[PDB]
Amino acid sequence: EFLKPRLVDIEQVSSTHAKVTLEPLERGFGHTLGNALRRILLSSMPGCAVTEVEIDGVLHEYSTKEGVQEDILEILLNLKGLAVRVQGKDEVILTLNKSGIGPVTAADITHDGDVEIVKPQHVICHLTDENASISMRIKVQRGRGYVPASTRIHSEEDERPIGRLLVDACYSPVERIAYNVEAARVEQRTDLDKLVIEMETNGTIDPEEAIRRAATILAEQLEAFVDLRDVEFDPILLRPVDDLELTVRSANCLKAEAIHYIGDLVQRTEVELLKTPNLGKKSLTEIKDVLASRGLSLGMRLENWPPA
Amino acid sequence: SVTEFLKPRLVDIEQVSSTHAKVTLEPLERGFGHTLGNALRRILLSSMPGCAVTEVEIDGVLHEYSTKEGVQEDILEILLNLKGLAVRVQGKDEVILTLNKSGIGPVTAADITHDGDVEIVKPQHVICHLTDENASISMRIKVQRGRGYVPASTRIHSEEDERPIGRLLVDACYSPVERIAYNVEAARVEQRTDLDKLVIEMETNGTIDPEEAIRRAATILAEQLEAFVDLRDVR
Amino acid sequence: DYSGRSVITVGPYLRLHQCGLPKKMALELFKPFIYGKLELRGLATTIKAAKKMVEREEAVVWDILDEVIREHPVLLNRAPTLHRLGIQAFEPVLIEGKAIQLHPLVCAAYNADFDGDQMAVHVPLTLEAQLEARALMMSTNNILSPANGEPIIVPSQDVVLGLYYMTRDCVNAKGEGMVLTGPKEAERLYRSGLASLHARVKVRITEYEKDANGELVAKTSLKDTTVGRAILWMIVPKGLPYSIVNQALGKKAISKMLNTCYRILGLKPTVIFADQIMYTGFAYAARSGASVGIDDMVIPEKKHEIISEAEAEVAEIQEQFQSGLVTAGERYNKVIDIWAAANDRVSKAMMDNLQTETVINRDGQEEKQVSFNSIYMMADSGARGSAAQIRQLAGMRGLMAKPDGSIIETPITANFREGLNVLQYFISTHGARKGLADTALKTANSGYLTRRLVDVAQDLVVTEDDCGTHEGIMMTPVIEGGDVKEPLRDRVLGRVTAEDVLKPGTADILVPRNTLLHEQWCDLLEENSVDAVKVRSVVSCDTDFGVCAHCYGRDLARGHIINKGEAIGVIAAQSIGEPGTQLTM
Amino acid sequence: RDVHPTHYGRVCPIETPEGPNIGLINSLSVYAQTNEYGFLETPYRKVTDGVVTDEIHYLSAIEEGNYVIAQANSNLDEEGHFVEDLVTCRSKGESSLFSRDQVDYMDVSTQQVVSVGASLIPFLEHDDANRALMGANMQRQAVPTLRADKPLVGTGMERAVAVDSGVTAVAKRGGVVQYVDASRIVIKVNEDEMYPGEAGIDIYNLTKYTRSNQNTCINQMPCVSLGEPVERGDVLADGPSTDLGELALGQNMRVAFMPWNGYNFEDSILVSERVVQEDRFTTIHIQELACVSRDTKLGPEEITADIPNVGEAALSKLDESGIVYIGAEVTGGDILVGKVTPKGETQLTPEEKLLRAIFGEKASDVKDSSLRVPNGVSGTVIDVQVFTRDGVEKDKR
Amino acid sequence: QVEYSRVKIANRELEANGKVGATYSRDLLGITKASLATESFISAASFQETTRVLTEAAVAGKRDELRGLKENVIVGRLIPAGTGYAYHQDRMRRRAAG
Amino acid sequence: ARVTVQDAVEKIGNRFDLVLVAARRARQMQVGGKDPLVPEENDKTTVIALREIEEGLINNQILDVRERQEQQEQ
Amino acid sequence: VDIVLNPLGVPSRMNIGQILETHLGMAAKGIGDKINAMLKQQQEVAKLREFIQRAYDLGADVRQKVDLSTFSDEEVMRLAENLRKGMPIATPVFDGAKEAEIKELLKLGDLPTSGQIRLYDGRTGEQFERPVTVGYMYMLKLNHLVDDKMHARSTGSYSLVTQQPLGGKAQFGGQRFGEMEVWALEAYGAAYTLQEMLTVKSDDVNGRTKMYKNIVDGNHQMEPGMPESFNVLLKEIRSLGINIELED
RNA sequence: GCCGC
Ligand SMILES: [Mg+2]
Ligand SMILES: [Zn+2]
């Protein structure tokens, strides 16, 4: 009953600019599909970006290197814009080492196994002195969105040495997207529309692959709508009461008074517990004396009590 | 980690009467509530197959403005009544019905002739409280299935004004969706806090309970993308 | 103790009783509560363990904090507390950040704006204090101001603009003469893009009336209206008439309709209606896309001609003065009057051009409707600005001088859309400096006056039910020459009559003695020709150490009569001293 | 505290504080200068016959009260004559139209009545006086950002404010640039100007990240690349909030004037996440913390790494001398300087004797008073500037 | 005080000697002069000149009795207005009955 | 959740007495020796007492008679 | 867009410089975008020099006489590479650009002369009904941040005299509940909140500990007392020749 | 004192 769009006439203006076309569309579906695809593509598209940089002789971002024109902060800012592609890995390490005179670019980054630099003219530093050397190690990770360098705390689980410089990660290859709806050339049908999506990336991701990823994300999200339906903690407690090494005389009394766990012991006040048969003033103090050794004063107030 | 997106769990449906429902889905990743709700609303409100009355024919005066012979209710109000009646026609693209009445009393939709294919969800719906005092009204309507809402800006049917006077150009409300509105609220899961909660408030004229309409709209929207998700599928 | 402070921002998603509390500002005010809940649940046995665990801020600590904030109200106040509405109790909502999210509808009561203000947060840590914060100082409790009786929580600015732009009519737009079965169809037509917000149509509308004794009756009919008004009709509660929607709603109809909803239905339908009004106003104001450009300030074409004529006239009077028949004072006064007349004519021409600028054709010929100019829309709707500011923006800036109180002879003939010369700007700096210096130096006088009033009236409390005195004072509408300032209705509303009210027909008793006048009684009095009503006052209560609840009329904050134990002297002092910061001395 | 008709070319009528001190604190105009006796002066152009001359006279408040002073924005022809017969003038604290021959002086320029702060507001004549006052007073509270950004719509006074302030580094005998670096510029002065003997070069040591009075950051970065000829007075490095020698204390933001769902209600501002990602409006703040070892009767105060009753985790970020390593990131209550204060005990009771036997010779008698980071303060350790007295042993660092 | 006069006259008029009752002429005072003449010396000493108010109170040997809002605030009790109105009503009946 | 306390106010109309009534009821239900007479929906004792007042089954007089009954029982 | 502001703040505050600077920045960035686009396509130096010369000669008889004829080709290349992000034009204080010059500057860069374009809602995809004024405005960042303005306290240190909490941040002080706030509390009728403010939270030395112990236990009971400040005042007045006492 | 409301 409903016509289906098909990806036809995929065209690439430049390394970054590109166009994608879907020829057959119904009366109102063009704008819905265009806006959904634009939101999905701008929001969540995977990519790889620089995570941290480790330069040879520097210690912090607010320092300077003798022989280079820029500060380390501007070096990190330049490295933040590096565009790479990695196949089969998510934690590649890109080593760089160059000495001499003039600017250094991404071209002189050491050729890794499967690592592609889409733009090999990206200037990241300037060397001014003849006998000056630079050497860094760049870690590139694959991600989905914007992750600040301060929010990640799990990286502090293992101690990090003094000299590792953390940069922010963007992970999004897509920078600009527009779409238009035009009248289709199909005359046998009454009135059909066509969709043309124009996107500007950093050259990391293919247009067709991006469209497929966005459509798969949308379909996986929509899968849920097609079927709606739906219409005492501290280990010191909950231990056996025969762990306090009490007297024989109190051992019989606790059984009669239905005290079997450490926890139920601590919920009894002095006034009423003394009324229990044959406790004894001096023997009761020994129960308090032993429970004091564990730090649990007599008379605590808990909320719930499971059988175990 | 990557490529894995949050999926809604513990959907809550608040049934109101028999045609009004409120659906809550959570959690949704940030910016997905707006996308899903807007796509669903656009599909449900602009493009949904359905059936509605598009033609009327009252014996006697046939002008858009009429004296109505004194039926205690203007013919414009008659058109407004017969516009809102919901019909579920089974297996027939077009069918024509007729209603005749006499004897003092309201003239409801049930007084129309009953056909096996047609299923009037609102037969108690009163078209008119008869002519004032005692008199007879005879009228024939026609129904057909279409898509979305098609205003009666022009007829462009038959020739001259024969089809207009035979129809009086009643607006066609094919899609059985009276009102749909969505609200996006903030929900949190564990340490994360920037997650969206989608609340869909939907009402339907009849012949369809709201959650089935939501399911149908989701079905058509998701099946539209099978040109890109078929090969790129997990299973 | 248990006090915090941070910068406030705006939260449009909030309810009238909710505020946004940062979770770092929390977990510090509620520390002992978290300790108690940790020790009670068994997560920590000793106080040291709970203290250390809160120090380490684990996840279950956040869970327990969320559990313990559940129904504990918190109260926010702003530093210059001028009246009792400057401190109110809300229900905290945990947000991530460092700024408090304040509901926009309470900003007018707080006199708060989001350009760098701060608030203070206090925790009412007692059952009695919690009940007092919930049942007395909640933001939903105080909706009418306790100084004049008008609503204090009222939509403003962007909400007003959204309501105004929503309920307007255009001569020709998408859809004309369409018949719609209800408000839902109008909303569907607008959302689908098949019609316009300002299109004129006919829609079936069902009304409700409270005419029956404590009973609601129905009424349906075909009304002539627009699409936007039909869409708005879905928000108003049942029992209200449709005449309150069929208007333009320029910040003065919306306050009146809120007041009618309060006086007819109650308190909770009023708060629900206010929240829904704010939501729909913000939504449609965002949808409109209203913006201000350099072409919105249109300058009247005749302004240059009027300027030239005025210049010729002052040249003529200068020549006449040179002839010697006029002294300095007479020519000075005549020049001032002529320039004032020229300014008035220029302003009138500019306003005439700006009012009905839009000339849009119709199905037949062409007509002239109210302009859709954005600046005129924001001025007429009352959202922001007035006529004088528009005159300064587009017409003549006018005459001004305050070096010592005199007036310069030559005026400023250039507005702000055009440039101002060096001399004209240097002249306007006089008024700017005087105004700012006056503003900075009157607050001390206002504070001293408020202190004296509060102390002189601190020990006044309603300590009796009815003194029983026959005394009173004479109430008549305030007249002054050929103008009227206060009708009897405003001066007698919510007052208890000391003597029986007689109609001009003799021996006819309308309302008995010792009765409370309200809207129905005031309307009945206005129907007849009553002119003077004898009402009792507090200066004739004759009770010792207090004031009777009958000699003092109804409290303005709540419709009912005032109850015993209400400190009225402090309320009166704050009501009198809250202005004065805006009194020009 | 009121503006006077004599405040025309001497003090600014716009720039002044708001609440307490309005009218009591003022700012000098751009061209105003102080007479020999101590009175304010302002320049004017001499007018002879009907042509304005180029010679400039400085007039005080008393002298200018007699003459007729024309307006800056009055049109003139090629030869200097007034293009219109009747021109606006100030005669004695007033404004009126005079003949083309009765004038005596003309204003030098249109900025004569505004200070430096108010000169940087484009379209000042289109703003209300008090709101422009607030804008001028708020322009001085800006915080320099990470990267400078010139204004697209400026005034032309940015160069003067940047050069005259002294934050930049300006060449004084500029020749050609020889060696460039993030911290130094060495310029080979040309032969045309040169002090005889010993040849000569110019060495500029830029000041890197340095704490300011308001705990902001002060940093200088070069503008010349290499071998680039420079002249005298050219800018070599641009200090805080300066781009290529132009005052740049803000950033160029793309703006839409529209209501958006109540998130810009009242005076609030709605900001996209892309502004956050590009690190615009990100500023560096620097803090100074100091500790002093001061003598006591019971003994000297020592700075040592080993701290009694302190775990090994706390000493991880301390060197062999007890001073943090440069670049370490400290948060919360970490220890910066390990300092120990002595305690007094000359009576060796048996319990203290066995305490000394079981544990170290001190047995932790010496109390610890170490410089710890205040709570809520975090950042990277930049510099340590240990100072020592004469005679005392030199610290390892 | 006017209230003392009205109370005293009523007691005198209730008894046989009704002519004992004294006529009075009401006075008008400013908000600054009617505040310093209050019968509670704890107030009127927290508002304006305190050396003069305390000096006159010390000589006369007067008492406060804490009958207003400001006195209870200083000594940290419940104010006799609002929710605390009921509590202050109970305390007065016990004093009257002993 | 009692957002507005209007009905509870009208049940015992002073807007000042119901604060004391709810305070004493909350003391009974929190300190001990009492249980709610309305279904507990994970709400604090203050709003539970407010709901009990709104439902028409809590007021000062019945509180006093229950106190007298418990006093006489012991 | 990067920033969204309210049109409601323009007319009442009377800032037309806002709108004029917005339009002028839009024109300047349009010229900069033209230069950047023409540099992207590796266009020859002649056409770029022609465009820059045309842009630098605009206005109605301005006094700037910048010419590219005497400019070296490398100098032209560097200058053009410096105008990719925008053309930094300048307007003096009391004389500068007018409406006509701004409009022709807009027309040079292929932008609408009205200064308003069509915006689409990023959430719904629908176009806003009216055109919206878009441009570039120079925004600063003031020195008032919430990292220095956020504070909270539950218990801390108190002064030896009057035993009340300290004041201000960096001492962990509490907010001051001044006289007007107490007047407002009295006008509300909140007597228990006021009493807990005056005694338990500030000066009742035993009351503070007792109320904290009750809160930890979960009692929510007050047990008030006598503020230390009144005792200090009594000792002060008694230190003169005046006797003041609390009679029974 | 300087600044913010
Ligand atoms: Mg403000
Ligand atoms: Zn009375």
Author numbering:
A (entry chain A): 7 to 237, 248 to 324
B (entry chain B): 4 to 238
C (entry chain D): 348 to 932
D (entry chain C): 548 to 944
E (entry chain D): 1279 to 1376
F (entry chain E): 2 to 75
G (entry chain C): 1094 to 1341
Could you give the paper's own sentences about this structure?
Transcription initiation in bacteria involves the recruitment of RNAP by sigma factors (σ) to promoter regions located upstream from the transcription start site (TSS, position +1). In approximately 60% of bacteria, a major variant σ factor, σ54, forms a class of its own, lacking structural and sequence similarity to σ70. In σ54-mediated transcription initiation, σ54 recruits RNAP to genes responsible for regulating a variety of stress responses, including nutrient depletion, membrane stress, antibiotic exposure, and biofilm formation.
Using a combination of focused classification and electron density subtraction, we obtained several distinct structural states within the same dataset, including pre- and post-translocated RNA states, as well as σ-free states. We focused on the pre- and post-translocated states which were resolved to 2.8 and 3.4 Å resolution respectively based on gold standard Fourier Shell Correlation curves. In the RPitc-5nt structures, we could resolve extra residues in RII, including 93–106 (Inset). We now refer to this β-hairpin (residues 104–112) as the RII-finger due to its functional similarity with the σ70 finger, also known as R3.2 in σ70.
